[PDB]
Enzyme design. Structure first.
Site, PDB file in Angstrom:
ATOM      1  N   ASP A 171       0.821  -1.207   0.000  1.00 13.99           N
ATOM      2  CA  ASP A 171       0.000   0.000   0.000  1.00 13.99           C
ATOM      3  C   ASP A 171       0.859   1.263   0.000  1.00 13.99           C
ATOM      4  O   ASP A 171       0.584   2.219  -0.741  1.00 13.99           O
ATOM      5  CB  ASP A 171      -0.940  -0.012   1.205  1.00 13.99           C
ATOM      6  CG  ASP A 171      -2.252   0.684   0.922  1.00 13.99           C
ATOM      7  OD1 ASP A 171      -2.519   0.932  -0.275  1.00 13.99           O
ATOM      8  OD2 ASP A 171      -3.002   0.999   1.879  1.00 13.99           O
ATOM      9  N   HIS A 254      -4.007   3.637  -7.574  1.00 18.02           N
ATOM     10  CA  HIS A 254      -5.213   3.340  -6.812  1.00 18.02           C
ATOM     11  C   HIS A 254      -6.450   3.230  -7.693  1.00 18.02           C
ATOM     12  O   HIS A 254      -7.336   2.414  -7.408  1.00 18.02           O
ATOM     13  CB  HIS A 254      -5.413   4.360  -5.706  1.00 18.02           C
ATOM     14  CG  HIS A 254      -4.779   3.937  -4.422  1.00 18.02           C
ATOM     15  ND1 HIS A 254      -3.427   3.681  -4.313  1.00 18.02           N
ATOM     16  CD2 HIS A 254      -5.310   3.665  -3.207  1.00 18.02           C
ATOM     17  CE1 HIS A 254      -3.146   3.303  -3.079  1.00 18.02           C
ATOM     18  NE2 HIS A 254      -4.272   3.286  -2.386  1.00 18.02           N
ATOM     19  N   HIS A 271      -6.084  -5.252   0.234  1.00 14.11           N
ATOM     20  CA  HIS A 271      -6.000  -3.944  -0.408  1.00 14.11           C
ATOM     21  C   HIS A 271      -4.605  -3.657  -0.944  1.00 14.11           C
ATOM     22  O   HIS A 271      -4.427  -3.336  -2.127  1.00 14.11           O
ATOM     23  CB  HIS A 271      -6.393  -2.849   0.587  1.00 14.11           C
ATOM     24  CG  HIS A 271      -6.278  -1.464   0.029  1.00 14.11           C
ATOM     25  ND1 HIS A 271      -7.232  -0.909  -0.795  1.00 14.11           N
ATOM     26  CD2 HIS A 271      -5.297  -0.540   0.139  1.00 14.11           C
ATOM     27  CE1 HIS A 271      -6.860   0.308  -1.145  1.00 14.11           C
ATOM     28  NE2 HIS A 271      -5.686   0.554  -0.595  1.00 14.11           N
TER      29      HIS A 271
END
Ligand SMILES: [Cl-]
Ligand SMILES: [Zn+2]
Ligand SMILES: [Zn+2]
Ligand SMILES: [Zn+2]
Ligand SMILES: [Zn+2]
Ligand SMILES: [Zn+2]
Lengths: 367, 367, 367, 367
Positions: A171, A254, A271
């Protein structure tokens, strides 16, 4: 346009820091609602209560439903007004933390956030994602400000599964490349302005910290112990990456993550694991130099993040599926339009296939 | 120990941002007290009022008496409680801003801070300094949190005398060297922990911004016009330097500043001008390399900051006075004890005389 | 001697640029003859016609015989005179484009050239290669000017076999080394003078573009999608390489290519595939340092170009054949005399055998 | 969008090259109109006549009125139609060349351009500036294509006043900085697209050529002799700078030039002399690093170009005049909007005053 940076008021990080929650939170309120799911309360409730007691605070613990729904926020609102709470303290993973931030907003009271994992950079952000009681997307709740305090126990995080740290690294690895893209293109950040010099410095510090400390930190995470390298990656995964993405900018990486959820194949991946491939796709899209692509691909691989579509269990109708991912990533209001030239679905589609090819050739060379 | 970084929740900077005060502040409260510097209100009050009105807010403007005294805080407290204000906005120089922060604390309301000069890094800090009505020091008021919002109008700042920008540069030039010193020594920051990776990156970014932009920014300040170099130096003097010093650490430079106020000769010089010579004294004390002393001296001189004792009007009983300065700088609880290995009054005395000697020789080369 | 650089008047490149031919070509002429082979007209005629119609232009489709012969140019001259064409548009591959350029010359009208592959650097040159009706090389036809316009559709080129892009890379990879050789030796260019600074800058940019973008572009090519790396290699293969060779100089690499067609074994390999081995032969001949030989061999190998005689199907009775290649390469009027100091057939013979050894030892070192 | 580069078909430069006009020009037309200034024909007409005659060409000498007006274009069109000329050859300075290019356009015939000074980068451009007979601005005439041939006699250019070579340098020095600006922002070039890699390479080659060769070339210019350094600066002033600006992009530097003509004080200064200060203004505006500002200021000063407003005789009522300059530079359709993020008239005003300060400080130091 105005230059804006926003930040949590205080970010605190240390080993066994939950022992010290009481002294840290006292200056904000005397009576606290403590939201935690049953698993988290299992190992921490004893310690939370002792810390507040020794500090002279009143606590009202309220086990968390597990989902961040308007129903659950309303439910906890009742318990809190009943117990006359002056602030909310969320403790646990992402959804439990989003619930605490949304609840504290509607009540108009300060919030403290204590992540028990470092797997996304959401904790420090002024954003809460609300779902329905049954788990479908519902709305975004952009909040007027960031959490008042963020307290990260590095020993608790070391105890978590190492895969969750690497997801956090995946991330945070996007942060620099998306902030840099927004700087190059003049895009507006989610803080409402252009990049401060500060936000870009924290974004780039994030990337270099992962390059210098990621592999060392994963060694510690897999042994569930705390070393200074783990300390630095947790700060990078949490504060640096949070301020970086929110006040530095989001872009193709993203948007591509959002596209990857528009198909079912990759539901069993975190994620940050999807963003890992989103970053590699953005590097193809902006035609980053070969040395930069290899550095990002090597670091992703070294910590177990996926660098191919197959490693996200996307193995079957790849052209058809990437066409959906591309259209979703280029949807109206998506952040891929912050890339310098902008991006068309045809262009994002191309980057998707090429990034996948690049990852495949890398896996067969490096082993 | 725990690693802590604290920050104002939102930092906003831009030309004519005073026009946008209303929209930026609306998310915090509906009813605002504006504590305003009389000179600032003189030319700006209509504009502040229009900004609040257009946003649908009710505002109560309160011209500021000029001193941050308990009397002045109490007087403004009354005006605010009568008008049922939910937040305080200070706008002006340091004393206006410190008064707004103290008032907002005693009332338990959010505070917004709008510096109209960039001459110190106090604006962003969780500290307010309270005096008696006639300007004599009284006490420190440590606040539990940093200002909720800081809003800097670059066009207003460009209007001030350039000497005020340079004083700001001297204040911010110390940041890297004192935070770096605290990092080397393990000292505790004003945020209560060890330095985060973040605070050190902002502190070093501050220093490099001054090196690359200071002379360019001074050019714009002297013409009272806004260029990107001025924007960056304003951000350094305000956000970077504020977060840098508070969450990175203080050391000899500020201690030497306090010591310099223990004598009358340099009373008529700004905070940042005394800090400028404190930084040179620290560099001698820690035996920084000659290239580093030369770079800090050259930049200081280039923007008009003092690099000799005579440039602070210290010309007569210099040994006797430097003895007082050194004893004061080493007082108990003074930050000079954060230097690696500490510092004795004899050591600080020597650094003062040698830094002055170094500065004089630099001036003789007419640089 | 005079320094001369020649260039097409306008070079245009983009995805789906075929749609825009009409507006791009309108300023040059109102009535256009469009020369194309059946396969190219198959996928492009509909789109060309719509583009000219919408722009207010008259089009006359003229299917192309397939050979660039004097008789075929004469045939199209007749068709053009009948339809009263003010300009010529060639749109296929190499022979189509050479025929369009020569036709436009004899006709005294402007020409637009639309390559559908990027496999040689001929498109931009003021040269047509003439064959007999039955397909034997006849002569080079030097043209008084470069094409008035060149329009490259990057999406069309992405659709073509990836092997053709690699051949284009092999063709363009020689540009810097032959221009650099001509600069060192003072040779005269096909533009009639010495090297401008401009042509040498474009030749070296070509080489570095292949070095940096070649492998990335091949990934996009193999997937038939358009990425910025593919865009760059197309420009390098077409404009940079074209102006480079014509206004920069030819040397041993192309002499050796011509020599390699003087034997039958390599009939089934493209122009750029033979030039690729010519470049390695030149590097041995001019005794480039091992780092330069290895960099060129690695890039050649990485995109599938031959770096050995065997990879050109030259496997039987190699000494005898190389003598013929060497003798052919040194024929009167060949460009190998542009090498510093010239080259004898014995010298080119030795360079061929040693370059072959070098390629073989490279392939044996695990690809 | 599309990547586009446009160029003259053939650019030739050499000592005494007018001796060779005939052989160079014969492939374009048999019958030539030669448009020439009375002074230029003074020393050149006999040599031109011999060159065309020996080559088998027919020439019709047409002395030039001195102004590039529609009346004068029509007057020459008549003489040309009477003498049944197939092409136009302009030979002289800027007005002669713009006249030749427009005439050749209206007649639909090729044009050859032979500059006798290297003081602007206009010669190679597809643009003509039309005036009224009495010298007031009339319109821009955008041409469908660039000149067919450009021929620069370096010995003729060496005979010109050295001030004009320096004016050419000032004009060419902006090329890189404006092309780089348009590249950073994605602006459209006057060629109708985004930057090719080729045009940026020529724009950067231009800048580096001036840095490495400017002072040596000025030495030769002042002695009116031809050296290889003078040849390179002529190529830079003419081909590199011309292709660079038209296919690379214009920005603040030329907008600021246009603003400077909006006031009378600088009427007696050449185009490139005003551009020189425009470049410095752009460097302040985009906040270039000090090393870059100093390098451009130092080179400008070394060849005699102005780096202050007073050196353009702008000494009185300067703020009032700079406000006129700033408003004009930001008028609609000006190229200043190609700067990243744009520029408001206030921002340009600030850049003007600060660049003036920087130049003054530079002159009193590094004299
Ligand atoms: Cl009142
Ligand atoms: Zn994320
Ligand atoms: Zn200070
Ligand atoms: Zn003071
Ligand atoms: Zn070739
Ligand atoms: Zn110009």
């Amino acid at each position: 346009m105005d230059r804006i940076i926003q930040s949590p008021g205080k970010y605190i990080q240390g080993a066994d820091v939950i022992n010290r929650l009481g002294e840290y939170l006292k200056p904000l309120a005397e009576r606290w609602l403590v939201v935690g799911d049953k698993f988290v309360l299992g190992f921490a409730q004893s310690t939370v209560e002792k810390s507040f007691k020794d500090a002279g605070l009143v606590v009202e613990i309220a086990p968390f439903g597990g989902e961040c729904s308007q129903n659950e926020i309303d439910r906890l609102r009742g318990i809190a007004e009943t117990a006359q709470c002056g602030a909310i303290l969320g403790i646990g993973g992402g959804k439990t933390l989003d619930t605490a931030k949304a609840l504290a907003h509607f009540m108009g009271v300060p919030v403290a956030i204590a992540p028990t994992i470092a797997s996304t950079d959401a904790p420090c952000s002024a954003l809460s994602v609300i779902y329905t009681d049954e788990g479908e997307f519902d709305r975004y709740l952009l909040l007027p400000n960031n959490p008042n305090m963020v307290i990260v126990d590095t020993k608790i995080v070391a105890g978590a599964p190492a895969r969750l740290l690497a997801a956090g690294i995946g991330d945070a690895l996007a942060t620099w490349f998306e902030a840099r893209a927004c700087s190059r293109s003049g895009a507006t950040t989610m803080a409402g302005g252009k990049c401060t010099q500060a936000a870009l410095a924290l974004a780039e510090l994030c990337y270099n910290t992962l390059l210098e400390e990621g592999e060392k930190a994963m060694l510690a995470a897999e042994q569930h112990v705390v070393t200074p390298a783990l300390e630095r990656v947790i700060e990078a995964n949490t504060y640096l990456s949070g301020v970086g993405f929110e006040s530095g900018g989001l872009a193709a990486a993203h948007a591509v993550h959002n596209g990857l959820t528009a198909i079912p194949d990759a539901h069993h991946y975190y994620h940050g694991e999807k963003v890992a491939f989103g970053t590699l796709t953005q590097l193809v899209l902006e035609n980053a130099p070969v040395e930069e692509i290899e550095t990002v691909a090597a670091l992703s691989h070294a910590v177990g993040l996926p660098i191919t579509l197959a490693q996200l269990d996307i193995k079957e109708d790849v052209p058809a599926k990437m066409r959906i991912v591309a259209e979703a990533a280029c949807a109206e209001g998506e952040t891929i339009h912050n890339m310098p030239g902008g991006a068309t679905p045809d262009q994002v589609y191309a980057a998707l296939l090429v990034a996948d090819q690049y990852g495949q050739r890398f896996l067969q060379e490096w082993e």
